[PDB]
Structure formats: C-alpha cells, structure tokens
mmCIF file of C-alpha atoms and ligand atoms in Angstrom:
data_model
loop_
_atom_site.group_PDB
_atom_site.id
_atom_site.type_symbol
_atom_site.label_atom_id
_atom_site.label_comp_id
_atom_site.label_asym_id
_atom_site.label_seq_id
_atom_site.Cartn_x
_atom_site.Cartn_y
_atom_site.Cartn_z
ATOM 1 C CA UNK A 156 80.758 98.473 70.445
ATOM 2 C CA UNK A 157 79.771 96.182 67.804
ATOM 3 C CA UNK A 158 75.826 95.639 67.700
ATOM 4 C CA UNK A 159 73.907 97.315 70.623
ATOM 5 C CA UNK A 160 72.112 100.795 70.449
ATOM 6 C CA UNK A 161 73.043 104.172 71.911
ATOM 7 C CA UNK A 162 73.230 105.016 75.217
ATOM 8 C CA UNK A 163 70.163 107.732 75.698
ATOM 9 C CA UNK A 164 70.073 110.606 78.068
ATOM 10 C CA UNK A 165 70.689 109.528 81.818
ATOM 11 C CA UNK A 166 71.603 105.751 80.355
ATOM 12 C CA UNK A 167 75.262 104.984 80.805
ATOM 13 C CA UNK A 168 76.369 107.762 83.695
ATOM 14 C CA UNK A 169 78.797 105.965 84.553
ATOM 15 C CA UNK A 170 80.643 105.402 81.200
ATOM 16 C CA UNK A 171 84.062 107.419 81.539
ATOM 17 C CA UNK A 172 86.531 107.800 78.222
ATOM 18 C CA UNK A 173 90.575 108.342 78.877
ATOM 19 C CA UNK A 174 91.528 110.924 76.225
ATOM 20 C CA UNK A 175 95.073 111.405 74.575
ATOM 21 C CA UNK A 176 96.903 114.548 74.338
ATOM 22 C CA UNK A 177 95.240 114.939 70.545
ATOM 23 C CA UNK A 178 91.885 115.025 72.733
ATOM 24 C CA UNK A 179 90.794 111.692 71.253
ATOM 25 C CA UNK A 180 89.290 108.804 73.667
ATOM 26 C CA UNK A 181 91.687 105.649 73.546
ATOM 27 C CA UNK A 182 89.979 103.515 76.145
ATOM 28 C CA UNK A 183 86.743 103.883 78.763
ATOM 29 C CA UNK A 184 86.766 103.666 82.495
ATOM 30 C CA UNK A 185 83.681 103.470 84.828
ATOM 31 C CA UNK A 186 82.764 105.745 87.439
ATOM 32 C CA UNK A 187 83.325 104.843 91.177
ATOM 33 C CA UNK A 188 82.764 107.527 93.187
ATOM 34 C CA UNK A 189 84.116 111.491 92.995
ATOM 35 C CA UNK A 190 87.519 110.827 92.769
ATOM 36 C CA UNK A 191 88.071 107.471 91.148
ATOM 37 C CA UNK A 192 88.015 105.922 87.775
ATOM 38 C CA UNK A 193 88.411 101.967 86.940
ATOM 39 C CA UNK A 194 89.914 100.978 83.908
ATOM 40 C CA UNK A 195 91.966 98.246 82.597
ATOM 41 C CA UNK A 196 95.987 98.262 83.101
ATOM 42 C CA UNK A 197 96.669 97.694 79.083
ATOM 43 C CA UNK A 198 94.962 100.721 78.765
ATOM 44 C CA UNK A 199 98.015 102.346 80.770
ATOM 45 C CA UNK A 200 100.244 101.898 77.887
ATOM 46 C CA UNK A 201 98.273 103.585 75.324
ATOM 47 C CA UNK A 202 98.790 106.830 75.973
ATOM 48 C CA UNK A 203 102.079 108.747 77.720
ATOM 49 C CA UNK A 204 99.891 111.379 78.799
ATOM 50 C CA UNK A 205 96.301 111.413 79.296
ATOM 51 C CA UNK A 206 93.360 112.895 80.859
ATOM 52 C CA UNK A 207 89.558 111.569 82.236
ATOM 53 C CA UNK A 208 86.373 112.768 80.319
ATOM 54 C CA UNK A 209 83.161 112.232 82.012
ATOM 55 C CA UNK A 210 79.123 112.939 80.831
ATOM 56 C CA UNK A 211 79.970 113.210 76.774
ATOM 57 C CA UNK A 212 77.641 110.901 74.420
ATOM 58 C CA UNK A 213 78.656 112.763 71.267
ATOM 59 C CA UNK A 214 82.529 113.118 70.716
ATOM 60 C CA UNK A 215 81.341 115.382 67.843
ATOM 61 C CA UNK A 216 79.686 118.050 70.088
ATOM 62 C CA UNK A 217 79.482 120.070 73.278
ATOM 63 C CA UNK A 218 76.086 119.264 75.141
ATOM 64 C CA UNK A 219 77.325 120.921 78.056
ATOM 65 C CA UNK A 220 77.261 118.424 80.425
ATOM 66 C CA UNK A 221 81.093 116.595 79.400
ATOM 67 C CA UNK A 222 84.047 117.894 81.535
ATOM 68 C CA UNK A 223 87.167 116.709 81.800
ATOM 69 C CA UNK A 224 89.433 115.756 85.067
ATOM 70 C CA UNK A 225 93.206 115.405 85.274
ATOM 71 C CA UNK A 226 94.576 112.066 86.971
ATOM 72 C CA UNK A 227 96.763 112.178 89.863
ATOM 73 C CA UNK A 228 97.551 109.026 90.827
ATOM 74 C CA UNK A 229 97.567 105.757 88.339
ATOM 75 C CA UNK A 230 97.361 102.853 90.446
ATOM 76 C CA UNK A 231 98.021 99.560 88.200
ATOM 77 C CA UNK A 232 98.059 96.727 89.271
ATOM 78 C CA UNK A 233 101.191 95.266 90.456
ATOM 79 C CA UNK A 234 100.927 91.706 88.582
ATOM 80 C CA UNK A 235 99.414 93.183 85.282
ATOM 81 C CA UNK A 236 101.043 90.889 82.556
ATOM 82 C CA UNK A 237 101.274 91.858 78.987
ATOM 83 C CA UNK A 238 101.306 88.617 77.997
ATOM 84 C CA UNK A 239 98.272 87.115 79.127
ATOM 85 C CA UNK A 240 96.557 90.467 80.514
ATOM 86 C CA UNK A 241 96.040 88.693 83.347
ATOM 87 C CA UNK A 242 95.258 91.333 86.438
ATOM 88 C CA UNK A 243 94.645 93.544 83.409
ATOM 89 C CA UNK A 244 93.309 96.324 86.343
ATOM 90 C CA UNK A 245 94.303 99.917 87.447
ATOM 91 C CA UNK A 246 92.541 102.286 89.294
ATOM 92 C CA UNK A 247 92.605 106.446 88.636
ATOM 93 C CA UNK A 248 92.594 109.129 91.571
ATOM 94 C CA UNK A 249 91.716 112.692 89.693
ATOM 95 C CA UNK A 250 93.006 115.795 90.481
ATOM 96 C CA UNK A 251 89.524 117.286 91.374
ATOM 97 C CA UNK A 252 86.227 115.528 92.021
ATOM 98 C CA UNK A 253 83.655 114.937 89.610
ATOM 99 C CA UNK A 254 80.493 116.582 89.919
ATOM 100 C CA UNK A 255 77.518 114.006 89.729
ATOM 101 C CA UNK A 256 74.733 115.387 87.208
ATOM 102 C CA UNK A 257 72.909 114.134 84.181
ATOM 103 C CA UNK A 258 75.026 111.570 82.497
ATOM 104 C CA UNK A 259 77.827 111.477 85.560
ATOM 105 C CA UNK A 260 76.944 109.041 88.359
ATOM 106 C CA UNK A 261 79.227 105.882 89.645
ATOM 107 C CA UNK A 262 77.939 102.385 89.128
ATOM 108 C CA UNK A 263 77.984 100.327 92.792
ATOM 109 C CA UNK A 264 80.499 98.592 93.484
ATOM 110 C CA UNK A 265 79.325 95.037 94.927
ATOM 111 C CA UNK A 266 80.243 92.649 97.388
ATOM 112 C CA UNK A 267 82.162 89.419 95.847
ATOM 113 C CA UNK A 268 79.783 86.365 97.544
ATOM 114 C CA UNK A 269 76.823 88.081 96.567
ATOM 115 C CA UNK A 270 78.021 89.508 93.566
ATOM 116 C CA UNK A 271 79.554 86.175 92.100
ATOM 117 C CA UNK A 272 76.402 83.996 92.949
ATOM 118 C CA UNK A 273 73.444 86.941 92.191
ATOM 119 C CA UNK A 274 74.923 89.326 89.840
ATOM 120 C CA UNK A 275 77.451 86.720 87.980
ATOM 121 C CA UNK A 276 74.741 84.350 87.181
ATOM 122 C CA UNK A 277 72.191 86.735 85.973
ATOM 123 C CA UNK A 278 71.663 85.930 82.118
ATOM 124 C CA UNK A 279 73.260 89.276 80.645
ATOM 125 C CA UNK A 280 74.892 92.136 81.771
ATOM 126 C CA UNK A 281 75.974 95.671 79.944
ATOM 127 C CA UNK A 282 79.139 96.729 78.189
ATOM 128 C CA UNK A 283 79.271 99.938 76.708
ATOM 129 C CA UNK A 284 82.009 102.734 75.304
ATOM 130 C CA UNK A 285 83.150 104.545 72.410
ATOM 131 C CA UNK A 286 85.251 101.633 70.769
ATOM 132 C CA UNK A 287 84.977 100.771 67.273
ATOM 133 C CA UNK A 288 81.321 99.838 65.622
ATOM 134 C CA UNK A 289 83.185 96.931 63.635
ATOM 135 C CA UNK A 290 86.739 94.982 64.152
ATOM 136 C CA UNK A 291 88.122 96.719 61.140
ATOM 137 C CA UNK A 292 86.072 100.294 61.437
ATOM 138 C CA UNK A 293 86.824 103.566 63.019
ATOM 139 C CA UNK A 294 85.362 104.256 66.927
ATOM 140 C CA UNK A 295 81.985 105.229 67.608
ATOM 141 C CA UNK A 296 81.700 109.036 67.872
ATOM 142 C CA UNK A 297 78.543 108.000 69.921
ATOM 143 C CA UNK A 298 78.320 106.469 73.118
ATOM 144 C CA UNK A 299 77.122 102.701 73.130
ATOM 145 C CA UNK A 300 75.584 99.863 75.208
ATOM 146 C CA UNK A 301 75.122 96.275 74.799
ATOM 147 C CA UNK A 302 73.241 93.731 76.555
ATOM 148 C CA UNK A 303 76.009 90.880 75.801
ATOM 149 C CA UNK A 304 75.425 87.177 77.541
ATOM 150 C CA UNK A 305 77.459 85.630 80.141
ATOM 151 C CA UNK A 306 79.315 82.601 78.858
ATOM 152 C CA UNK A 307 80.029 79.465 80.786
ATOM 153 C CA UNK A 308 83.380 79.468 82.028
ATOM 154 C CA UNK A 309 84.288 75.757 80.090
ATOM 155 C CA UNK A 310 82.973 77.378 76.897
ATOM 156 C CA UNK A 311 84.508 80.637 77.229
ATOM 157 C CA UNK A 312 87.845 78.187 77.741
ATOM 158 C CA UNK A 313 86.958 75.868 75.071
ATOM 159 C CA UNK A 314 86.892 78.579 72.775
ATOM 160 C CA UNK A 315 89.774 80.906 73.255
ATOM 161 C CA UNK A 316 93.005 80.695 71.866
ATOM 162 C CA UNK A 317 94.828 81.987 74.607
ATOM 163 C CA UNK A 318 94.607 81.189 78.672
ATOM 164 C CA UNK A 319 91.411 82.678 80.457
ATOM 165 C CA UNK A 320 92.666 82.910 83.896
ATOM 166 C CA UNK A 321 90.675 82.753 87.249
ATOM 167 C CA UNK A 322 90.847 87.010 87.254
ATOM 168 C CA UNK A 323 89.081 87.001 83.838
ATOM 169 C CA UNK A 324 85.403 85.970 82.491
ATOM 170 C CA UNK A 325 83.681 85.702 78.874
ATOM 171 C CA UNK A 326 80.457 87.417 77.916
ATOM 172 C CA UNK A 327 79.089 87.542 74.265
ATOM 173 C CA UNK A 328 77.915 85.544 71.606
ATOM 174 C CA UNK A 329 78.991 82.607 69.888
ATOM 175 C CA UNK A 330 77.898 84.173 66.548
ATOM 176 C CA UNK A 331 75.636 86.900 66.612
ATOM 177 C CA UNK A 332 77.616 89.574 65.838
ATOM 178 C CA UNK A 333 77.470 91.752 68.767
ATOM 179 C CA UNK A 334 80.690 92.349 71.258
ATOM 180 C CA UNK A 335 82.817 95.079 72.780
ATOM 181 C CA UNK A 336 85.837 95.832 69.881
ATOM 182 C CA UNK A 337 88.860 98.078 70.383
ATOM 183 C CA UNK A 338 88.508 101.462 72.124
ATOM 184 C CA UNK A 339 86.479 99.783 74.801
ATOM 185 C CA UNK A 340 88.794 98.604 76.485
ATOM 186 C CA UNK A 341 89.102 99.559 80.074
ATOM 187 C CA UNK A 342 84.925 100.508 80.166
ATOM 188 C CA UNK A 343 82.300 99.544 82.204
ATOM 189 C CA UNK A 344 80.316 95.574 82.467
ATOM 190 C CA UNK A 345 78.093 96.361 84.458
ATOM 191 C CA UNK A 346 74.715 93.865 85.767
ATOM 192 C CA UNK A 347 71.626 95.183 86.702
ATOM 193 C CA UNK A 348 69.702 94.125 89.616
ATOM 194 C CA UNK A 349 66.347 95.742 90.172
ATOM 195 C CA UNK A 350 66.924 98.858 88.637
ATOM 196 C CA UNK A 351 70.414 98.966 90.334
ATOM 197 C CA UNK A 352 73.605 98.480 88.326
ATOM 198 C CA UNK A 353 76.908 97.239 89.172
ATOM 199 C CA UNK A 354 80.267 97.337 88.201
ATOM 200 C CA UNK A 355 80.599 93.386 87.460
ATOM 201 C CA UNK A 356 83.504 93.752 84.849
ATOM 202 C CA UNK A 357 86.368 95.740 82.767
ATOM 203 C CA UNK A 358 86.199 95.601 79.162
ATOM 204 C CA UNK A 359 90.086 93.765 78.691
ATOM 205 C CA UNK A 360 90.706 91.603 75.047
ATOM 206 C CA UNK A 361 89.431 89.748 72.605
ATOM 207 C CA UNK A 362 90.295 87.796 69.533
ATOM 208 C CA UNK A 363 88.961 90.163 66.899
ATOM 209 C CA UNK A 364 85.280 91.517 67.922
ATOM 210 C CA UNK A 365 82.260 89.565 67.221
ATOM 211 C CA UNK A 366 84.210 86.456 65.832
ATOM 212 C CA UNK A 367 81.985 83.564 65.319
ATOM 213 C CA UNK A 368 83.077 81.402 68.110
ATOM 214 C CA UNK A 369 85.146 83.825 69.916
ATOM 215 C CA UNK A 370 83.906 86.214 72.938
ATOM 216 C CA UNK A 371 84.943 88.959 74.906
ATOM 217 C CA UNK A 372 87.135 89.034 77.501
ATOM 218 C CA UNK A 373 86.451 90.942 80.556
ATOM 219 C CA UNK A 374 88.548 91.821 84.044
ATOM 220 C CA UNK A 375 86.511 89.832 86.463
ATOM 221 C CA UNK A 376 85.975 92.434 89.449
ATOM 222 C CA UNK A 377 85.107 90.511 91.561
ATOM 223 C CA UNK A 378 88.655 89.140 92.161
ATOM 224 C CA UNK A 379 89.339 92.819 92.916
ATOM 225 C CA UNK A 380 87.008 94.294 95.026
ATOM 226 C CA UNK A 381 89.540 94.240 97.872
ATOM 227 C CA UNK A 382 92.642 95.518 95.853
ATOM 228 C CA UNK A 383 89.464 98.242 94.358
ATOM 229 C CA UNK A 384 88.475 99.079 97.872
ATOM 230 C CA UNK A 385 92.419 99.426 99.565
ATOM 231 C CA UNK A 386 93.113 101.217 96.155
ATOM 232 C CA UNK A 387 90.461 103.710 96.894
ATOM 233 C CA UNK A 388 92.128 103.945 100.334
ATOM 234 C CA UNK B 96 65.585 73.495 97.156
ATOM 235 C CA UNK B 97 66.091 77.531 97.076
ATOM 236 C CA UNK B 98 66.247 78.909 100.449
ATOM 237 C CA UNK B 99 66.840 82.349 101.649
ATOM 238 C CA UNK B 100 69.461 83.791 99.803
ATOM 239 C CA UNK B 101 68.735 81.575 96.858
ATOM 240 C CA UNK B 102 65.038 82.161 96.976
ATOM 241 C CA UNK B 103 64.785 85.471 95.323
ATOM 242 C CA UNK B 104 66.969 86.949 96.862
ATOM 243 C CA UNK B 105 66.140 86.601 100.059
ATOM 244 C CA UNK B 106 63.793 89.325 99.433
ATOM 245 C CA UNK B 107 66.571 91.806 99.519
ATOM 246 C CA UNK B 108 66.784 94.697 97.405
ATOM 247 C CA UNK B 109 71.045 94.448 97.110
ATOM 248 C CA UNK B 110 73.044 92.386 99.053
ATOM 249 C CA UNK B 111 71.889 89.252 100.586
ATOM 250 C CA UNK B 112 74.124 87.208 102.875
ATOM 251 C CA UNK B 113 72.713 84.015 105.090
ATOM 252 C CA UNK B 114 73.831 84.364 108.365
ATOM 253 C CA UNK B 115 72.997 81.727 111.005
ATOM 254 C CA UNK B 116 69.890 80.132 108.790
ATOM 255 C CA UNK B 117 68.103 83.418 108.017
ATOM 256 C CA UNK B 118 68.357 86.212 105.385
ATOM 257 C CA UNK B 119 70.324 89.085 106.352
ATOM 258 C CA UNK B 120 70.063 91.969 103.809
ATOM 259 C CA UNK B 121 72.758 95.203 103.149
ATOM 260 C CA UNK B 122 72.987 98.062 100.696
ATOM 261 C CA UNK B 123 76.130 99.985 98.610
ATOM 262 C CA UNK B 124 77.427 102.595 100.149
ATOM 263 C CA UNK B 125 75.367 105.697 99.957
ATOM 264 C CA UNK B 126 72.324 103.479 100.462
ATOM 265 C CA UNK B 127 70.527 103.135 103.791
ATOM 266 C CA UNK B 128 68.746 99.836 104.801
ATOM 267 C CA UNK B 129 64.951 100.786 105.167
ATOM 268 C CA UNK B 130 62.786 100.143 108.576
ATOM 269 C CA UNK B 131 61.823 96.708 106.665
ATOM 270 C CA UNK B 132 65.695 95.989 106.851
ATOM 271 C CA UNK B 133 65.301 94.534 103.118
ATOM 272 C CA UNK B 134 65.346 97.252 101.022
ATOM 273 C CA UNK B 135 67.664 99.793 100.346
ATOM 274 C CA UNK B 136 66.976 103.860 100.154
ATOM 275 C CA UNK B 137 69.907 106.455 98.254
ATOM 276 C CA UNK B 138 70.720 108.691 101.190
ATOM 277 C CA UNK B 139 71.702 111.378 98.696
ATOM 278 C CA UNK B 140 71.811 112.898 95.214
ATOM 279 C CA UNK B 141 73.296 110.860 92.996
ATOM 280 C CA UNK B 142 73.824 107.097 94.111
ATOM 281 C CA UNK B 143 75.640 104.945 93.007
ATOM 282 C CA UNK B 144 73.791 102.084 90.137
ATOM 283 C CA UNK B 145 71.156 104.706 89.530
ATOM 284 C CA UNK B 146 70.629 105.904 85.641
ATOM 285 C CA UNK B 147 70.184 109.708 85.481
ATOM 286 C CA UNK B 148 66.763 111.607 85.208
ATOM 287 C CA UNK B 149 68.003 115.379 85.864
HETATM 288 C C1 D14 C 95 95.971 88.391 75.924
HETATM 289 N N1 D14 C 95 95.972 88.831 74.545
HETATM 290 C C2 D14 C 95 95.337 90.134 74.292
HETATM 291 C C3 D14 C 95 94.832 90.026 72.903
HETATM 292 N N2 D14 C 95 94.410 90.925 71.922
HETATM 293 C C4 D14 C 95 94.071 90.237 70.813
HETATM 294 C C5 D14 C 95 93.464 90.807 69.583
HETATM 295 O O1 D14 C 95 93.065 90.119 68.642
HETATM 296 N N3 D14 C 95 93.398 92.131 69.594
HETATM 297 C C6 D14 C 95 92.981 92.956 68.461
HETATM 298 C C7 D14 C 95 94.101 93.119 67.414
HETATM 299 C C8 D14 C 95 95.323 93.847 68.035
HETATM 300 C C9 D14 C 95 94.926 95.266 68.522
HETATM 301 C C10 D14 C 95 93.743 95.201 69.513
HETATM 302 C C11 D14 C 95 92.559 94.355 68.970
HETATM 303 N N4 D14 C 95 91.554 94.172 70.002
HETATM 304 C C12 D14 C 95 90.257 94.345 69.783
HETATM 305 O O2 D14 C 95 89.808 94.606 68.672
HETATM 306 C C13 D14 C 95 89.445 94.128 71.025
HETATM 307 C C14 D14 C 95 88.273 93.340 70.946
HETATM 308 C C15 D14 C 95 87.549 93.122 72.114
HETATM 309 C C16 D14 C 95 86.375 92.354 72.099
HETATM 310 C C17 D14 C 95 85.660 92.151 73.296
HETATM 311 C C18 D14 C 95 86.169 92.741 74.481
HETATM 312 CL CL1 D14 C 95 85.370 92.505 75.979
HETATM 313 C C19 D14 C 95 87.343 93.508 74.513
HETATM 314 C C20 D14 C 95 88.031 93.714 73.323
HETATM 315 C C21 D14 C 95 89.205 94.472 73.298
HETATM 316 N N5 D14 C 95 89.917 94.682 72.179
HETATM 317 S S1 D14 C 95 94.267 88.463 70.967
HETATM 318 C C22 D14 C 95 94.818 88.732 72.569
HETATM 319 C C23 D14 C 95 95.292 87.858 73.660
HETATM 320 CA CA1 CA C 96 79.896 115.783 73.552
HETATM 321 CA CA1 CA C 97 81.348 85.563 68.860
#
C-alpha cells in the first residue's frame, strides 16, 4: 500500500496474508468465513508451497493474536489467463477453521444487483495488505488500508494500457499518489455500508503503483459471487 | 425520481431488492432481519463486515 495509514486494532479483520515456505507474505487474501480464503489466481503461481496467516498487523512481532492455517484445497479459477489476468480469482479451503477474535473476522459477502448498484457506486471503498509502501520499495512490515476512489469504467479504459475486461474494475487516483503496489495482490476491496463492510473486490494488477494516470486493477466480485458461493460448496 | 430501492436504500440496513413496487429488505448470512423487517441483527459472535472491538 502506497499512501493510506495503518490498519489499527480491530480495523482490517479480515485482511489475510499467504506466506512462503521462508515465512514471508507474498500476496493477501480476505476472510470469508471459517474455512475459506479469497485471493487472486496470479497469486497461485508465486509460491510452490504456501500457507494462510490470519490476525498479524506487525510482520516484525508476535502480538499473540496471528496464527497460521494450512490450505487444503486451491480452487482457481478455471479461465484464469496469464495474459490478461482476466478471471484472476481462486478460492482457499484450510485445513482447520479459523477462530474469529480480535483482528480475525470475514468481510460479507454481498449479493451482485444490490451490490453492483449500492455498494459499486458508493464514492470509495478500502484496499488494504502488506504490499510494498512505494513501486520500487520493500513491503510494508505493517498492515495497511486505503480509502482509494472508484473510477468510471470509460476512464479506467481510457487509461490503461492493456484490456480491462467485464470481470475487472479500476479504483484509485489519477495522480495522487496513493494505490495498492505489489504484495497486495490477492487482498481485500472491500465497501462499507453503514458500518458494514463488504468484500467488493481482489487486489489483481496494475501498471506500476500510483502512476499518474494509471489505476489499480481489481477482480470485480461481483462477477463471482456464484462461482464464490458453489466454490464454498 | 429515486424510489424505493434508489431512495436510500429503501431504508434497508443491507440488501435491498424491489419486488412487485415495494422495498423488500435481506441481510448476509449470520444476520437476522429484525421485527421492522429493515434492519439487520448479527445472530452471533463475530459477523461477518463487522470491525473488531474484543
Ligand atoms: C495483465 N497484466 C498484469 C500486469 N502487471 C503489470 C505491472 O506493471 N506489474 C508490476 C511490474 C512487474 C511485477 C509486478 C508489478 N506489479 C505491481 O507493482 C502491482 C501494482 C498494483 C497496483 C494496484 C493494484 Cl489494485 C494491484 C497492483 C498489483 N501489482 S502491467 C500488467 C498487465
Ligand atoms: Ca505480528
Ligand atoms: Ca494514478
């Protein structure tokens, strides 16, 4: 996260980070319920082996609430496409269930009308992870958030260099330099609506992070909330 | 001009769907739809959307 401030105590419960064998977070995932992560399919290829840590804010120490879940299942979705990241979407069954406390809760999961018309069209909505603090710079050994503008669909097109597909959306600025950046990738957008926030996106790509006149690129769940829900089982 | 749905919300605390020509309201899952049938109480510890305070 480029920009933004830390998430405080209780603030981002649903954040989730996908560790590699080294025990270092390579991408973020959002909380659905006990036994599922969402992240982003890219994110798949990171890593040969990797694990689920939930409830940390500070990679550099133990506040005793983090703990750590083994995947079982890594459902990706079938018409991911490196090239475009189009249906850039999987969904994580763990091993055991995580236990909801301070710091681990799952975002809601909306429905797509309401979502799309309500939620979509709000002004802003939340990214947050552990991805770098600048395009160039190392990640964020601190949790972050962002309040980061949704961006007209004609703009968002206008703008990128590469094809923004119906399963995708913009949010950002046009200069301000604020935006998700690499490590994100796979974490939580999430829109709140009266003190209630949902899952609304998956951090996916971007051209460089805070680029004047570029944005970020984000998973559009609402495409997916059928695939999330069958997925789920 | 806004009408249900598009009128706040319909008055809904979550969901808000427009069914025949009048408001009908719903909640995530681990919510329950209150006697008012517009807004929407956690049935549980831990719902879903809900920062954490312990
Ligand atoms: C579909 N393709 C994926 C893609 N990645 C592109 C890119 O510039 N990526 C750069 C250089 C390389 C290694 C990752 C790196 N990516 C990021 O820094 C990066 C920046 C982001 C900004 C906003 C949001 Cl929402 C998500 C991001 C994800 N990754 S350009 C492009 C088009
Ligand atoms: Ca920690
Ligand atoms: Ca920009």
């Amino acid at each position: 996260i480029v920009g933004g401030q830390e998430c405080k105590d209780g603030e981002c419960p649903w954040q989730a980070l996908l560790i590699n064998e080294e025990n270092e977070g390579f991408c973020g995932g959002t909380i659905l319920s006990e036994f599922y992560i969402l992240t982003a399919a890219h994110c798949l290829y990171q890593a040969k082996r990797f694990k689920v840590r939930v409830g940390d804010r500070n990679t550099e120490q133990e506040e005793g609430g983090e703990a750590v879940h083994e995947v079982e299942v890594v459902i990706k979705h079938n018409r991911f496409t490196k090239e475009t990241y189009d249906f850039d979407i999987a969904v994580l069954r763990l091993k055991t269930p995580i236990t909801f406390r301070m710091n681990v809760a799952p975002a809601c999961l909306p429905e797509r009308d309401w979502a799309e018309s309500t939620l979509m069209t709000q002004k802003t909505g939340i990214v947050s992870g552990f991805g770098r603090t600048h395009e160039k710079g190392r990640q964020s050994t601190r949790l972050k958030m962002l309040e980061v503008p949704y961006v007209d669909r004609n703009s968002c097109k206008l703008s990128s260099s590469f094809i923004i597909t119906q399963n995708m959306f913009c949010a950002g600025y046009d200069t301000k330099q604020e935006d998700a950046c690499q490590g994100d990738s796979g974490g939580p957008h999430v829109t709140r609506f009266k003190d209630t926030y949902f899952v609304t996106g998956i951090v996916s790509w971007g051209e460089g992070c805070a680029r004047k006149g570029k944005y970020g690129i984000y998973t559009k769940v609402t495409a997916f909330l059928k695939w999330i829900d069958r997925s789920m089982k | 001009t806004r009408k249900l749905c598009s009128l706040d919300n319909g008055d809904c605390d979550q969901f808000c769907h427009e069914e025949q020509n009048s408001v009908v309201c719903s909640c995530a899952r681990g919510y329950t739809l209150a006697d008012n049938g517009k807004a929407c109480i956690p049935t549980g510890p831990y719902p879903c959307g809900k920062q954490t305070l312990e």
